[PDB]
Coordinates of C-alpha atoms in Angstrom, one line a residue:
Chain E
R1 CA 22.0 9.6 8.1
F2 CA 19.1 11.2 6.1
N3 CA 18.5 8.4 4.3
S4 CA 18.2 6.0 7.4
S5 CA 15.9 8.3 9.6
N6 CA 12.6 7.6 10.6
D7 CA 10.6 10.2 8.7
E8 CA 12.3 9.2 5.4
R9 CA 11.9 5.6 6.2
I10 CA 8.1 6.3 6.8
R11 CA 7.8 8.6 3.8
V12 CA 9.3 5.8 1.4
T13 CA 7.3 3.2 2.8
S14 CA 4.0 5.1 2.4
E15 CA 4.7 6.1 -1.3
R16 CA 5.6 2.4 -2.2
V17 CA 2.4 1.1 -0.3
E18 CA 0.4 3.5 -2.4
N19 CA 1.8 2.5 -5.7
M20 CA 1.9 -1.4 -4.8
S21 CA -2.0 -0.9 -3.6
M22 CA -2.7 0.7 -7.1
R23 CA -0.9 -2.0 -9.2
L24 CA -2.6 -4.8 -7.2
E25 CA -6.1 -3.3 -7.7
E26 CA -5.4 -3.0 -11.3
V27 CA -4.3 -6.6 -11.3
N28 CA -7.3 -7.8 -9.4
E29 CA -9.6 -5.7 -11.5
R30 CA -8.4 -6.9 -15.0
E31 CA -8.3 -10.9 -14.3
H32 CA -8.9 -13.1 -17.3
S33 CA -10.4 -16.1 -15.4
Chain Z
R1 CA 1.5 20.1 7.3
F2 CA -1.4 18.0 8.5
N3 CA -1.2 15.5 5.7
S4 CA 2.4 15.3 5.8
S5 CA 2.9 14.5 9.7
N6 CA 4.1 11.1 10.7
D7 CA 0.8 10.3 12.6
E8 CA -1.5 10.6 9.4
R9 CA 1.5 9.0 7.2
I10 CA 1.5 6.0 9.6
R11 CA -2.5 5.5 9.7
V12 CA -2.9 6.1 6.0
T13 CA -0.5 3.2 5.5
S14 CA -2.1 0.9 7.9
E15 CA -5.3 1.2 6.4
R16 CA -4.0 0.8 2.7
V17 CA -2.0 -2.3 3.9
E18 CA -5.0 -3.6 5.5
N19 CA -7.2 -3.2 2.3
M20 CA -4.2 -4.7 0.2
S21 CA -4.2 -7.7 2.5
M22 CA -7.7 -8.4 2.2
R23 CA -7.6 -8.4 -1.9
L24 CA -4.6 -10.4 -1.7
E25 CA -5.8 -13.1 0.3
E26 CA -9.1 -12.9 -2.0
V27 CA -6.8 -13.3 -5.1
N28 CA -4.9 -16.2 -3.5
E29 CA -7.8 -18.3 -2.2
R30 CA -9.9 -17.9 -5.1
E31 CA -7.8 -19.3 -8.3
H32 CA -8.8 -20.6 -11.9
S33 CA -5.9 -23.3 -11.8

């Protein structure tokens, strides 16, 4: 019940979005062509 | 308390998703191969 509530499901999404944005910016800045 | 509320945690996620979508579209449309 704790892991399926709206608050945790928003917090996990926010953290994963932040990490994904950081990795995507790293990928796009480090192009080789 | 302000930075951990649901409203800010949704707004930040929306803005970062917008930026990530723009950058990913730029990456996909512009390819060397």
